Write an enzyme that holds these catalytic residues in place. Structure first.
Site, mmCIF file in Angstrom:
data_model
loop_
_atom_site.group_PDB
_atom_site.id
_atom_site.type_symbol
_atom_site.label_atom_id
_atom_site.label_comp_id
_atom_site.label_asym_id
_atom_site.label_seq_id
_atom_site.Cartn_x
_atom_site.Cartn_y
_atom_site.Cartn_z
ATOM 1 C CG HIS A 89 -1.851 -1.129 1.476
ATOM 2 N ND1 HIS A 89 -2.934 -1.292 0.715
ATOM 3 C CD2 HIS A 89 -1.613 -2.195 2.275
ATOM 4 C CE1 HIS A 89 -3.377 -2.413 1.059
ATOM 5 N NE2 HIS A 89 -2.770 -3.049 1.954
ATOM 6 C CG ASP A 92 -1.924 10.974 -4.931
ATOM 7 O OD1 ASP A 92 -2.151 12.290 -4.428
ATOM 8 O OD2 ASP A 92 -2.578 10.818 -6.217
ATOM 9 C CG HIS A 94 -6.096 14.130 -5.083
ATOM 10 N ND1 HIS A 94 -7.420 14.203 -5.669
ATOM 11 C CD2 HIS A 94 -5.515 13.068 -5.402
ATOM 12 C CE1 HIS A 94 -7.470 13.156 -6.277
ATOM 13 N NE2 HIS A 94 -6.512 12.367 -6.041
ATOM 14 C CG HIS A 129 -6.659 7.906 -3.943
ATOM 15 N ND1 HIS A 129 -5.678 7.002 -4.785
ATOM 16 C CD2 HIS A 129 -6.640 8.939 -4.542
ATOM 17 C CE1 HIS A 129 -5.327 7.955 -5.861
ATOM 18 N NE2 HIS A 129 -5.826 9.012 -5.657
ATOM 19 C CB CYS A 130 -4.168 3.181 -1.205
ATOM 20 S SG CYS A 130 -2.904 1.821 -1.717
ATOM 21 C CG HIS A 139 -4.848 -1.138 -3.424
ATOM 22 N ND1 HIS A 139 -4.156 -1.202 -2.232
ATOM 23 C CD2 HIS A 139 -4.596 -1.925 -4.353
ATOM 24 C CE1 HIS A 139 -3.496 -2.392 -2.248
ATOM 25 N NE2 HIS A 139 -3.785 -2.885 -3.437
ATOM 26 C CG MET A 144 -6.533 2.248 1.382
ATOM 27 S SD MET A 144 -5.206 0.778 1.050
ATOM 28 C CE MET A 144 -4.178 1.653 2.373
ATOM 29 C CG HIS A 249 -30.929 17.150 -2.789
ATOM 30 N ND1 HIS A 249 -31.394 18.210 -3.314
ATOM 31 C CD2 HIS A 249 -31.894 16.985 -1.718
ATOM 32 C CE1 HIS A 249 -32.326 18.810 -3.021
ATOM 33 N NE2 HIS A 249 -33.002 17.881 -2.136
ATOM 34 C CD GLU A 273 -32.789 22.108 -7.366
ATOM 35 O OE1 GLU A 273 -33.387 21.588 -7.336
ATOM 36 O OE2 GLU A 273 -32.364 22.801 -8.474
ATOM 37 C CB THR A 274 -28.596 18.971 -6.478
ATOM 38 O OG1 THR A 274 -29.843 18.511 -5.726
ATOM 39 C CG2 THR A 274 -27.736 17.861 -6.621
ATOM 40 C CG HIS A 300 -31.385 14.248 -5.920
ATOM 41 N ND1 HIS A 300 -32.212 14.045 -6.976
ATOM 42 C CD2 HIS A 300 -32.127 14.853 -5.108
ATOM 43 C CE1 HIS A 300 -33.558 14.238 -6.658
ATOM 44 N NE2 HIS A 300 -33.404 14.864 -5.367
HETATM 45 CU CU LIG Z 1 -3.753 0.028 -0.576
HETATM 46 CU CU LIG Z 2 -35.138 15.513 -4.635
HETATM 47 CU CU LIG Z 3 -6.051 10.634 -6.792
#
Ligand SMILES: [Cu+2]
Ligand SMILES: [Cu+2]
Ligand SMILES: [Cu+2]
Ligand SMILES: [Cu+2]
Ligand SMILES: [Cu+2]
Ligand SMILES: [Cu+2]
Lengths: 334, 334, 334
Positions: A89, A92, A94, A129-130, A139, A144, A249, A273-274, A300
């Site tokens: 494993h 990373d 971001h 994330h891995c 993964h 993960m 939502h 709303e969303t 949604h």
């Molecule tokens: Cu992993």
């Molecule tokens: Cu709705």
């Molecule tokens: Cu990524």
């Protein structure tokens, strides 16, 4: 400035959807903020049918815990892969710059650990994330992944530059799983990760999730684990999706201020709303509750919400406002 | 202020894509705006092959009609479920605050009616839809959704704060249907809603629509029902999708000002080719026509547009501008 | 002003991901910018398995080349369909106004050519694609799409109005292919386009791509064809997707300034991890590299990236910044 001259603070993480302690507005200068996470491969039951998968986790949860720092702090993570695990494993971020977000520097076999440091130069919520070369989506879609929040040193601001201060924060990690199915449509289980791998690849290549869940399982954010708030409280909901788009939502509410793609140097979108959180992103929504009762919080695509698992609840306390909404004539014959 | 002291106005709705009468800039103070909708379960033919489904509608149409109010008006809806229907229904307004958008207060069995009131506190276009607990995506993806527009009291504004005034408005509701298929790929029909329900759930769980249509059927916004405009007219197109993302595009034009996620307190995006309306949202695009002729208006997954139904037409009258576009050499040999 | 009084300049296009010569800030007044493209139907191998398809291209590539002009220039395109091709083709520019973006004016049978002119009235990156009535998604998803960049006459600007000047530009075209599969899951090939057409339609109607690639094939932007940069260089990556949404991400970096929906009159989004380019759109991301080494550039549905092909690499030269990132303790036992 020489990093060994900076304060060090050790964070103790909490399990999602809760978030460890922190101050919105930075009360110190830049720090090295120390975190530890222990990788855990573990069986998880993900639905009401009892479907059990082999999850790959940071710190025992899906999602991994939310880490919180301020802009221009240094994140120093000790990542431990105990010998009770079987796979390679890494991690990373971001939020980070260089070396595949840290992945190129953090490859740990069972029985190994590593410590990574990076400068959190950009404010926002970010996925982590891995990502082991050649096995990345396996993964990530085994659970993960988590998120990190890098607050501006002076806290959050609205579209006009005035402060936005939350009273409560929650972290919703949304996970698409790809449980392999036989030709009749029933889930397969496997005896080792290697024996599973081709059919995991096959399942992933259909691009169709079998499950899409919040906090690791159907119903996890309901009942005794429903999110809570009170009328008049300001709540920030951080929401991540490491692999597929989602469209959050709040049923009965709104996102009053939303950073849909999660980056706080940008003005938020108002009155949503969303909103669309792209796969590979964390977003954040701020809402002040105005009504008590039960709310659902969903992806949604309502099929994804109510058939595949992407739904949680808030239970909100306080007094009902009949000016904002009322039943004039309750349901009755004719 | 005491709501019984406010003016009442009764709206008479029109069938989409047309929109009932209203004033962009509010000519009165806040009002209670009264609407009535009658639920209709009805068979609809949705494609050129003759595929007939059992649709669930507000007011007889897919989508339901566009309701229009101003910010801080009260919406008072009388929702009628006639005894000729067979199912339980309700309504959730994304414009509203509390009680699952109204859904928790509006549950009506066949033979019942109810009246809901809410304050339209946020300006924008918003989805409304049926959402009966435990059967939500079935009702929505059977066509039981529409939209409401809450105009700012001083009308629409551009990214600089100057007025934007439309000459015409249309409402495009986009519907994903999930018609159940046998193993050979042919649609099944069913004898009762209960006998259909499991295979509707099964069809929905594939996440793959069989049809994606505007105004309830393949081709509905074409021919004698094409949208119309003239060169130099300012047109607002409200577009909703209650369950899946869409990516609208005016073929031969643009969205000059677009609120992709539909909320008018935000500055619009300018000069869009295509925009993303997330599932569970209404968006709005303003365009001033500059050329006559036929336009198509599509979801720009072109498979969804041209194979699954998500395409309509404008017919635009007026004079051709050869400065903006011309054929210098018409198609010819070599 | 009379168009025959304007300067003419002939552009000579280059193959993606490279971009023909141009000046960011316009060094002349408005011009008629002349382009020529020759349609080529050709076999292409798209994956490591050797899967070969019948691609439909502008100028021999998938994507078609990036065209670059300034706002209020005229684009004059000579489009040639040689008699060695078998199909009817045309072109629709999302940058253009009228006649289905030019498609209604540019229908060319094998052995024909045409010249179209349009005024590039809106600044941004835009899709262009073939769109023959009744066969639109087949042509687009066979690779027959590219992009055009219409720069503001005074070049790019940040969210505050100050200049943004790139040192390098690349054009990533992302292509969803729908290679027809038999019931066992193996690709079919076909003897003529007509014999292929129904199963292409069938494959497209599943909505599930078999391949999603950058620059026309799995691995095309890797190895000896990896993108390159140096630490401290400002790079613009134009990214298009004519038919499906994508969510670009620079692994180890960010989009410092991103026009996700591609239109330069709008302020960019800052500090993006990932962004959503809707199907039918071009977007653009500006980044200043801060670390050397290998980066991947992906669609962050990681299944799409690493199993279906939507991944390329940068190789970046220069010195490593241990303040931004360092391994404090390299991976080791315990
Ligand atoms: Cu992993
Ligand atoms: Cu709705
Ligand atoms: Cu990524
Ligand atoms: Cu209903
Ligand atoms: Cu073509
Ligand atoms: Cu197009």
């Amino acid at each position: 400035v020489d990093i060994s001259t900076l304060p060090r603070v050790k964070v103790d993480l909490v399990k999602p959807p809760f978030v460890h302690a922190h101050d919105q507005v930075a009360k110190t200068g830049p720090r090295v903020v120390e975190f530890t996470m222990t990788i855990e491969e573990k069986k998880l039951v993900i639905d009401r049918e009892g479907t059990e998968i082999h999850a790959m986790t940071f710190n025992g949860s899906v999602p991994g815990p939310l880490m919180v720092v301020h802009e221009n702090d240094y994140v120093e993570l000790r990542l431990i892969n105990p010998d009770t695990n079987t796979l390679l494993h890494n991690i990373d971020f971001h939020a980070a710059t260089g070396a595949l977000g840290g992945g190129a520097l953090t490859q740990v076999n069972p029985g190994e650990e590593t410590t990574l440091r990076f400068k959190a130069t950009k404010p926002g919520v970010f996925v982590y994330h891995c990502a082991p070369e050649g096995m990345v989506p396996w993964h990530v879609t085994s659970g993960m992944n988590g998120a990190i929040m890098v607050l501006p040193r002076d806290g959050l601001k609205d579209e006009k530059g005035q402060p936005l201060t939350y009273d409560k924060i929650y972290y919703v990690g949304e996970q698409d799983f790809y449980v392999p199915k036989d030709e009749a449509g029933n889930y397969k289980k496997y005896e080792t990760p290697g024996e599973a791998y081709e059919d995991a690849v096959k399942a992933m290549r259909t691009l169709t999730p079998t499950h899409i869940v919040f906090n690791g399982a159907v119903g996890a954010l309901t009942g005794d684990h429903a999110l809570t708030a009170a009328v008049g409280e300001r709540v920030l909901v951080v929401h991540s999706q490491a692999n597929r788009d989602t469209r959050p939502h709040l049923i009965g509410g709104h996102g009053d201020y939303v950073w849909a793609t999660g980056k706080f140097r940008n003005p938020p979108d108002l009155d949503q709303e969303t909103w669309l959180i792209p796969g590979g992103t964390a977003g954040a929504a701020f809402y002040t509750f105005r009504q008590p009762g039960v709310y659902a919080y969903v992806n949604h695509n309502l099929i994804e919400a109510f058939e595949l698992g992407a739904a949680g609840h808030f239970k909100v306390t306080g007094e009902w406002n009949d000016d904002l909404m009322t039943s004039v004539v309750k349901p009755a014959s004719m």
